[PDB]
Amino acid sequence: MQIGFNFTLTGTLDMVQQMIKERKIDYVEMLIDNFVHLPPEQIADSFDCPVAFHIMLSKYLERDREALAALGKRLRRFIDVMRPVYVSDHILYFTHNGRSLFHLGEIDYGEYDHVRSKVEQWQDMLGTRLYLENYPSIMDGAWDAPSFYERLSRETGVGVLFDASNAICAQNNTGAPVELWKKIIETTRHFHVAGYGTAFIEPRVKADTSDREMAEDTLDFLSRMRTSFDKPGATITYERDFDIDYESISVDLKRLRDIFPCV
């Protein structure tokens, strides 16, 4: 298990480079579509470690093809220069009838035929194996998603970026046990982990706010099934998007390495 950190804001650089130098993380996952106008060689020369790619806002499920192709070709040039460990993206509903959601929607997994066609086309544009992340479900599509990603992954060669946190959100909001994902966990080698929050008006509903330490059950999940997570090429990226505190992050990182010792 290589441990990673997600680099999203330009002003976290000095701190991220210091966790690299101090061997607290082995690679850097990059929200690459935020840096598409940066010179790609510059990113590779700011990290003395491997990088991986996470794409937030392709909107490949809805974006027009001319804009989508241009993004793909720019991402292709970045893939060539940095050789990312993997390239990943999401399954997200961004836009209802022309207007933008600010809290992104879980796609309706009954729409398999539509997702499949866009995933194939997007992954073709990217020119490489794509990994798709699971939504931190609130509504009951949580019970549908494990069987849906499995299907999508064998008809299209696509990988699953299994985010343990989001699956535990899914469990707490819908009952849908994380065990539903065992076959995917034992297949993919790339994982996400973060802390989750709560709604302002319902502490029982869990939000993917990425702002705090991981829960005691997101750590039980990685502990209980560390054998199924860990495998030869395996990685887990720790996400912290808000309250980016060097010491609060650093203990969650060691907390990860306690679960996955180096040998």
Partner: protein
């Protein structure tokens, strides 16, 4: 122990109501579908007011006197909640009970908010800076530039003064995009999207 999904099952059933605080009531208080809409309305709330806290001096701390009326006015006028979001709030504000209390100190934070949103979410490869103009900001503009170096020690949004006279836009706001990180040319203002 779980909150019932009650009238619905999956997020797709809730799409139409995720930005409509009027229709939130029609879901049972104890229902999960009520909760999910609330999470999504809070997201619109916080995007508006965390980024532009001085607007709470107008609405009061709950932001209600702006938010509810602006939300319902947004569905009516079918805005896309695009990067022009903030500017579209200020436009609504210009015709609300608050129209007399707008000044530069309210105007500039919403222009910086829309400029930052554009340079964060926009995925057009041949669009490098956005240039925002308003009729309440003569001779100057708010320019939002995408990141083009990991080492820029400056902010990506700047107020810039022009030397040649700059036309007032037709509406309260107008904008244009530049293909690189220079402004060599003024193509004339375009109206706010949506």
């Amino acid at each position: 122990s779980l909150l019932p999904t009650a009238p619905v099952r999956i997020d797709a059933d809730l799409y139409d109501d995720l930005a409509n605080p009027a229709r939130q009531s029609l879901y049972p208080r104890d229902s999960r579908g009520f909760i999910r809409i609330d999470i999504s309305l809070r997201a619109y709330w916080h995007t508006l007011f965390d980024t532009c806290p001085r607007l709470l001096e107008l609405s009061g701390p709950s932001g209600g006197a702006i938010f509810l009326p602006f939300m319902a006015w947004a569905r009516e006028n079918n805005l896309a909640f695009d990067w022009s979001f903030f500017l579209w709030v200020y436009v609504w504000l210009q015709q609300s009970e608050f129209r007399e209390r707008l000044d530069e100190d309210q105007l500039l934070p919403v222009m910086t908010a829309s400029a930052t949103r554009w340079l964060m979410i926009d995925r057009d490869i041949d669009a490098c800076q956005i240039v925002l103009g308003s009729r309440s900001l003569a001779g100057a503009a708010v320019v939002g530039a995408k990141i083009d170096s990991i080492h820029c020690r400056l902010e990506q949004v700047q107020q810039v003064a022009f030397a040649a006279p700059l036309p007032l836009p037709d509406g309260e706001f107008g904008y244009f995009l530049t293909p690189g990180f220079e402004i060599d040319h003024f193509p004339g203002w375009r109206p706010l999207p949506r």
